[PDB]
């Protein structure tokens, strides 16, 4: 009976509502974030179009600022509202301090945006576990993952959404300095990583790559198909 | 028939606001009854003053209050709430005169008093006032007037009304009276109120057992008949 409020501790010091909140993130599409030497790739799976609705109004990977993109999981209604606030925060800090936002700060603000909602009753937590990736660090690539709890974490590679356990296990054993050593090699890893898509369609994988002092680049469904093909060609070494 | 009740803002399934309903049943907890009879040019209010102690300062045990130089009111119900309703009224009239340049007609003073009671029935902030008010005043262009504002905010124009434990017979007695149309002389009206209160209770009405208020068109001022006069009136009723 200690789960019908947000600021009521359970007998064992648990914030059960926050624990339930991370249940939404496990029910979104798999979003994997791997940070490379010069291109921090982050992908989205389970694109799952409806065959009669345009996919532009579906975008799940959004660039919070010119140097930081943000791919989320969780419930969409809250994801749009968090991104809008973060986008406004990236510009507002820029005006207050000339230097543009870094990836870690925006994550700290996003985690600061979520946390203030889980702290008090009469307000529901954002149920999104967002992967914050961006080169704006001005030299060092950096990808973070938030948590509807309010804790931001830094991973050299991640997996959020429905299948984090499967993707994450398959990602640790295949991520090495050799793998990240090449840009096209770096993207080949995520495409391989998200290749464990619920149905492994190979056609519902969307990877977006951002490069040092570059601009975001939503891979077109011709370069991805080539990369999906190329990765398939590389995987063709099994026989 | 308790209903959802426990909250004044939650309708019963039938469309009956039980909490407001219970207000009236609190009205007769005062254990007393007041009757107002409108004559040809006068209105007389008679109340029950049952002082249950030889120590009580009889001067301040009155149920009759003077809202304004031309309007007099009697409370039937909880003394504490009736006092607040009296005090709220006085401001409402004084704001009426100060705001429009003339004394507030007895018509509205029950309306504004009723309107105040009505919002306490919607916004679950104030527990409703458990007392009915009767406003008597010599109104220009409309002769003497009587009004009775209930806990739920319903006010009506009464040729004669009575609120208290014995309301059903008091009104039935009056209902028997008003119908055999007669010249309601000031003596007739004052007598009518005394008989109504007497018959229902079955009491002799010793001089001090009641507090009769009187307002007449000739002298449009609220007066409380001094104990000598009620005895004179009472003896007149006997013969």
């Amino acid at each position: 009976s200690y789960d019908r409020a947000i600021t009521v501790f359970s007998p064992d010091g648990h914030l059960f509502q926050v624990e339930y909140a991370q249940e939404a993130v496990k029910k979104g599409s798999t979003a994997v974030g791997v940070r490379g030497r010069d291109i921090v790739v982050l992908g989205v799976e389970k694109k799952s179009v409806a065959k009669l609705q345009d996919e532009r109004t579906v975008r799940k990977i959004c660039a919070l600022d010119d140097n930081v993109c943000m791919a989320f999981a969780g419930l969409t209604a809250d994801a749009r509202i968090v991104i809008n606030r973060a986008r406004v925060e990236c510009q507002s800090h820029r005006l207050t301090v000339e230097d543009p936002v870094t990836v870690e700060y925006i994550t700290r603000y996003i985690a600061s945006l979520k946390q203030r909602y889980t702290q008090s009753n009469g307000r529901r937590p954002f149920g999104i576990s967002a992967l914050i990736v961006g080169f704006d660090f001005d030299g060092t690539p950096r990808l973070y993952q938030t948590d509807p709890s309010g804790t931001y974490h830094a991973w050299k590679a991640n997996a959020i959404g429905r299948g984090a356990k499967s993707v994450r296990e398959f990602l640790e054993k295949n991520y090495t300095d050799e793998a990240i050593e090449t840009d096209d090699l770096t993207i080949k890893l995520v495409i391989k990583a998200l290749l464990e898509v619920v149905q492994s369609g190979g056609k519902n994988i969307e990877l977006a790559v951002m490069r040092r002092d570059q601009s975001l680049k939503i891979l077109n469904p011709e370069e991805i198909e080539k990369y999906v093909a190329e990765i398939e060609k590389e995987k063709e070494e099994n026989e | 028939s308790a209903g959802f009740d426990r909250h004044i803002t939650i309708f019963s399934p039938e469309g009956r606001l039980y909490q407001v309903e219970y207000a009236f049943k609190a009205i007769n907890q005062g254990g007393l009854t007041s009757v107002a009879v409108r004559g040809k040019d006068c209105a007389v209010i008679v109340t029950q003053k049952k002082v249950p102690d030889k120590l009580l300062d009889s001067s301040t045990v009155t149920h009759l209050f003077k809202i304004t130089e031309n309007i007099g009111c009697v409370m039937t119900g909880m003394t504490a709430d009736s006092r607040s309703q009296v005090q709220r009224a006085r401001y409402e009239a004084a704001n009426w005169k100060y705001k429009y340049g003339y004394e507030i007609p007895v018509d509205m003073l029950c309306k504004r008093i009723a309107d105040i009671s009505q919002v306490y029935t919607q916004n679950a902030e104030m527990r409703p006032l458990g007392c009915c008010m009767i406003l008597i005043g010599i109104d220009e262009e409309q002769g003497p007037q009587v009004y009775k504002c209930d806990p739920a905010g319903y006010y009506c124009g009464f040729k004669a009304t009575a609120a208290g434990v014995k309301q059903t017979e008091s009104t039935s007695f009056l209902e028997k009276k008003v119908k055999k149309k007669f010249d309601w002389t000031f003596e007739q009206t004052v007598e009518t109120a005394i008989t109504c209160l007497s018959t229902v209770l079955s009491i002799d009405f010793k001089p001090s057992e009641i507090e009769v208020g009187v307002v007449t068109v000739e002298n449009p001022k609220f007066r409380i008949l001094t104990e000598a006069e009620i005895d004179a009136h009472l003896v007149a009723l006997a013969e």
Partner: protein
């Protein structure tokens, strides 16, 4: 049950239970009495010293609302002190707003309305202290008012608040308070109080008195120590 948890809920029979409970917690207080002499009002309160370690005259229940008014809280003390502070802020705002001492009746009415103001909201509970006000004025005689928790306030020639309310009027009802000057009333208020307070229960006790009238010249200050001594002696001699 169900209707007895919130002060703003009316029982189907039509009453605010919360107020009733508080008025029935005042029954669990020390007896307090008030008698208005022909030119004043007298307050005599039994104070039960709950243990030998509270210094004499502590947590006193006889308060001075204003220069001329008097309070004799009977009931939960902590609630009383709160009611005292509100009264003084009501008086102080009076004298500064109308240039003269707030008449006892109006001080009781405003103080009564405040008390009734707390029996209307669920966010607050009704006051648990019912108090008697006393004052004397050459322009207004002597006035004594009992403000019970519910908000009702009408004056009493002599009243008692506490465990022994019925026992306290009965022996107060046998006095002609209309005439005797509270010079002689203090000897009577003190004599009354000792009749109440059966010794076998409640063990030890102490008695505090105060008066308002000509004798005080319009103030409420405590009866001079000398007067009390004989008064207590005078009441003590009435053991038979």
């Amino acid at each position: 049950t169900g209707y007895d948890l919130s002060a703003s809920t009316f029982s189907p029979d039509g009453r605010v239970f919360q107020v009733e409970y508080a008025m029935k917690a005042v029954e669990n207080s020390s007896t307090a009495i008030g008698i208005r002499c022909k030119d004043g009002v007298v307050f005599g309160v039994e104070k039960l010293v709950l243990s030998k370690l509270y210094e004499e005259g502590s947590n006193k229940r006889l308060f001075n609302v204003d220069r001329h008014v008097g309070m004799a809280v009977a009931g939960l003390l902590a609630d009383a002190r709160s009611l005292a502070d509100i009264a003084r802020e009501e008086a102080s705002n009076f004298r500064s707003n109308f240039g003269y001492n707030i008449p006892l009746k109006h001080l009781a009415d405003r103080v009564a309305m405040y008390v009734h103001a707390y029996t209307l909201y669920s966010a607050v509970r009704p006051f648990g202290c019912s108090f008697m006000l006393g004052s004397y004025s050459v322009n207004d005689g002597a006035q004594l008012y009992m403000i019970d928790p519910s908000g009702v306030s009408y004056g009493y020639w002599g009243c008692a608040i506490g465990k022994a309310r019925q026992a306290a009027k009965t022996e107060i009802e046998k006095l002609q308070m209309k005439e005797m000057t509270c010079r002689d009333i203090v000897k009577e208020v003190a004599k009354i109080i000792y009749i109440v307070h059966d010794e076998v229960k409640d063990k030890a006790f102490e008695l505090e008195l105060s008066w308002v009238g000509e004798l005080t010249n319009g103030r409420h200050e405590i009866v001079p120590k000398d007067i009390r001594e004989e008064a207590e002696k005078y009441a003590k001699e009435s053991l038979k």
